[PDB]
């Protein structure tokens, strides 16, 4: 296992911080003019995390098309992802409008709504069957149909209805609920099981739009999920599976959204998840 040997070499050298800073230095820089317009100030959760203009998702209704979300198109892996921030109280209607317009059928959430007493995301889906949500700005209704609550993740069956046309769609909400409050998981086992459950659900089917992935900023935990999923896809396809270079894959994803993988510990965990998932 070449990656397992390079991993052990990086560990033995204590050079995760060094590799991670090289990634930061080598990462693409593209404009984010739309994100920074005055009229979009209250659409961004974090002033330092913005979508590039070239890859941002545009909303189709007529007054303001902006959402803090990026299309990551991993051409060789043959999968696209939408990475987005945790919705704000005023952007939940936009979030579901994006889900509708992009034809997504899965949402991957990697945070709890509150962590360490701080809010990471608005409560953008209904917790009770009988208390559906109506987004009057985007004319959508969202109902909780059922959920399967497990020890380390929950999968919810939501019904999203376009109130204009009365069309309905089933959306699966894949909520990883156990990422630690600080740092990364000690073992990737639970995270891998979750990733495989998302894949097995039929959500990443090329018949549907891209999966929507978020955490609080849509770059750290979300970057780890995207990076691990993309590397596992490449290994399951490439003639030489050991030729998958995780640093190069990450730099490719960073052409589409800034800041993906926010710490050297996230980078090490991504390597560890890919190594362990490849064995599986
Ligand atoms: Cl403006
Ligand atoms: Cl960064």
Swiss-Prot record:
Superkingdom assignment: Eukaryota
Cysteine sulfinic acid (-SO2H): residues carrying this PTM: 215
Residues noted as binding substrate in the record, renumbered to the chain: 181, 215-221, 262
This enzyme's EC code(s): 3.1.3.48
A GO CC term attached to the entry: endoplasmic reticulum
EC main group: hydrolase
Residue numbers bearing the Cysteine persulfide modification: 215
Active site: 215 (phosphocysteine intermediate)
Effect on the protein upon substituting residue 50 to A/D: No phosphorylation
Function, as annotated: Tyrosine-protein phosphatase which acts as a regulator of endoplasmic reticulum unfolded protein response. Mediates dephosphorylation of EIF2AK3/PERK; inactivating the protein kinase activity of EIF2AK3/PERK. May play an important role in CKII- and p60c-src-induced signal transduction cascades. May regulate the EFNA5-EPHA3 signaling pathway which modulates cell reorganization and cell-cell repulsion. May also regulate the hepatocyte growth factor receptor signaling pathway through dephosphorylation of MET.
Protein name: Tyrosine-protein phosphatase non-receptor type 1
UniProt organism field: Homo sapiens
Species lineage: Eukaryota, Metazoa, Chordata, Craniata, Vertebrata
Gene, per the UniProt record: PTPN1
């Amino acid at each position: 296992m070449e990656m397992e040997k390079e991993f052990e070499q990086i560990d033995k050298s204590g050079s995760w911080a060094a590799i991670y800073q090289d990634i930061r230095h080598e990462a693409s820089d593209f404009p984010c003019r739309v994100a920074k317009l005055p009229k979009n100030k209250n659409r961004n959760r974090y002033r330092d995390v913005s979508p590039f203009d070239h890859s941002r998702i545009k909303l189709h209704q007529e007054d303001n098309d902006y959402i803090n979300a990026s299309l990551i198109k991993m051409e060789e892996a043959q999968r696209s992802y939408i990475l987005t921030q945790g919705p704000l109280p005023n952007t939940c209607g936009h979030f579901w409008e994006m889900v509708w317009e992009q034809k997504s059928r899965g949402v991957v959430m990697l945070n709890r709504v509150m962590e360490k007493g701080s809010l990471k995301c608005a409560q953008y889906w209904p917790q009770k069957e009988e208390k559906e949500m109506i987004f009057e700005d985007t004319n959508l209704k969202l109902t909780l149909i059922s959920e399967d609550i497990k020890s380390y993740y929950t999968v919810r069956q939501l019904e999203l209805e376009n109130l204009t046309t009365q069309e309905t769609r089933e959306i699966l909400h894949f909520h990883y609920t156990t990422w630690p409050d600080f740092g990364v998981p000690e073992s990737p086992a639970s995270f891998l099981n979750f990733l495989f459950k998302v894949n097995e659900s039929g959500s990443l089917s090329p018949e549907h739009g891209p999966v929507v992935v978020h955490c609080s900023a849509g770059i750290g935990r979300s970057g780890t999920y995207c990076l691990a999923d993309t590397c596992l896809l490449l290994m399951d396809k490439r003639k030489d599976p050991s030729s998958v270079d995780i640093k190069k894959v990450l730099l490719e994803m960073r052409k589409f959204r800034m800041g993906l993988i926010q710490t050297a510990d996230q980078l090490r965990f991504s390597y560890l998840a890919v190594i362990e998932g490849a064995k599986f």
